[PDB]
């Protein structure tokens, strides 16, 4: 399968999450995503075919993970934006106030701005700290998906948000939205990963 940020993948033939970013760990191919999407050794599938397994994860506390892929997978320096693509050019972290977008299997490509940093989310499983907040809307299933600027700087992966009864927070004003992502930099260093860029 072609590994592109934002696309859907399943975990152990059950949950569905979104791909974060194509990365390499030496000769090993992989993609980063959210830790709450799967447990170590869980099997990831795309298009009905097995593409790899969860190599490591931290959740709660943090919300990160990476999936080790088979050599047959095709790593790409891109994130899905509708039928088009946003090229991943680096991982420079944007400051509060910057515009940012994310790609996910549920809400597609959504944009907004970064409103706060170091935010704590109190999830059912426990607290997750150090998350960055944005007013771009999101929905269930977008988890693990790419957060990136229009200039191609990868910011992190989708962790959670204050979704409403319809499963997303797109139905309420931006001023009332809290969409949270796990910063990419600590994920890359935690697992010794290098971003695939173009």
UniProtKB/Swiss-Prot annotation:
GO terms for cellular component: extracellular region. GO terms for molecular function: serine-type endopeptidase activity. It comes from the Bacteria. Disulfide bonds join 17-37, 101-111, 137-170. Keywords: Disulfide bond, Hydrolase, Protease, Serine protease, Signal, Zymogen. One of its GO terms (biological process) is proteolysis. The keyword Lyase does not apply. The active site is at 36 (charge relay system), 63 (charge relay system), 143 (charge relay system). Belongs to the peptidase S1 family. This is Alpha-lytic protease. It comes from Lysobacter enzymogenes. The gene is alpha-LP.
């Amino acid at each position: 399968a072609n590994i592109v940020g934002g696309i859907e993948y399943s975990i152990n033939n059950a949950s569905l999450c979104s791909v974060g970013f194509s990365v390499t760990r030496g000769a090993t191919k992989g993609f980063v995503t959210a830790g709450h999407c799967g447990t170590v050794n869980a099997t990831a599938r795309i298009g009905g075919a097995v593409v790899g397994t969860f190599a490591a994860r931290v959740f709660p506390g943090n919300d990160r993970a990476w999936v080790s892929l088979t050599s047959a997978q095709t790593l790409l320096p891109r994130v899905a934006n509708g039928s088009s693509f946003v090229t991943v050019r680096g991982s420079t972290e944007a400051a509060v106030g910057a515009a940012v977008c994310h790609s996910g299997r549920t809400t597609g490509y959504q944009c907004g701005t970064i409103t706060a940093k170091n935010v704590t989310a109190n999830y059912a499983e426990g607290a997750v700290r150090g998350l960055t907040q944005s007013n771009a809307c999101m929905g269930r299933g977008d988890s693990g998906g790419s957060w990136i600027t229009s200039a191609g700087q990868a910011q992190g992966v989708m962790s959670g948000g204050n979704v409403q009864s319809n499963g997303n927070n797109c139905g309420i004003p931006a001023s009332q939205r809290s969409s949270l992502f796990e910063r990419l930099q600590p994920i890359l260093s935690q697992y010794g990963l290098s971003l695939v860029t173009g």
